[PDB]
């Protein structure tokens, strides 16, 4: 989807 992380990049 639209999402931001440092680690587990999502949907």
Request: no cysteine.
């Amino acid at each position: 989807x639209l999402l931001v992380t440092a680690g587990l990049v999502l949907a």
